[PDB]
């Protein structure tokens, strides 16, 4: 079992999503899949390595404009950020 972590930024991003009335079940379900070692993820998540040279970092789509950024190694799963393309890349 991978150790589970989340960043301080991740906590702020989930609070913002909550405030924006996003459907938190979509995000929670995806988080559970990752925690449960469901890899590769179902195709609907369009999961892929994060753009750039950040080792082990990946990018999954909860919705077309709701992204989860996380790091995944054999020992570790860390939830890093979540939000729109504008919030994460813009």
């Amino acid at each position: 079992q991978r150790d589970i972590e989340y960043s301080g930024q991740y906590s702020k991003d989930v609070k913002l999503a909550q405030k924006r009335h996003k459907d938190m079940n979509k995000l929670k379900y995806l988080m559970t899949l990752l925690i449960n070692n469901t890899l590769p993820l179902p195709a609907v998540y369009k999961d892929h390595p994060l753009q750039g040279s950040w080792k082990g970092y990946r990018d999954a789509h909860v919705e077309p404009d709701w992204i989860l950024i996380y790091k995944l190694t054999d020992k570790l799963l860390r939830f890093e950020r979540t939000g729109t393309h504008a919030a994460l890349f813009g």
Binding site: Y6, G8, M24, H48, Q51, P64, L88
Partner: protein
Amino acid sequence: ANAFVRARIDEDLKNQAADVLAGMGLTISDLVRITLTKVAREKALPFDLREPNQLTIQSIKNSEAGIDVHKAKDADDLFDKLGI
């Protein structure tokens, strides 16, 4: 039926992109049509168009250094700590 895409662009960027594309037999207008077709079909953007921004990168750098990182025992514990 036929519409036009018209976009302002830096002329030097345009020239460079056109050169890259010309090597693979594409024009800029071909790339515009192909990209928009993909967007319309998938209702989503192509992957990886932009690098992570400064705030995302700062979060990754902090986390990699062990700064402002939090542990959770399992999903229930995690959702509880996050307040979701």
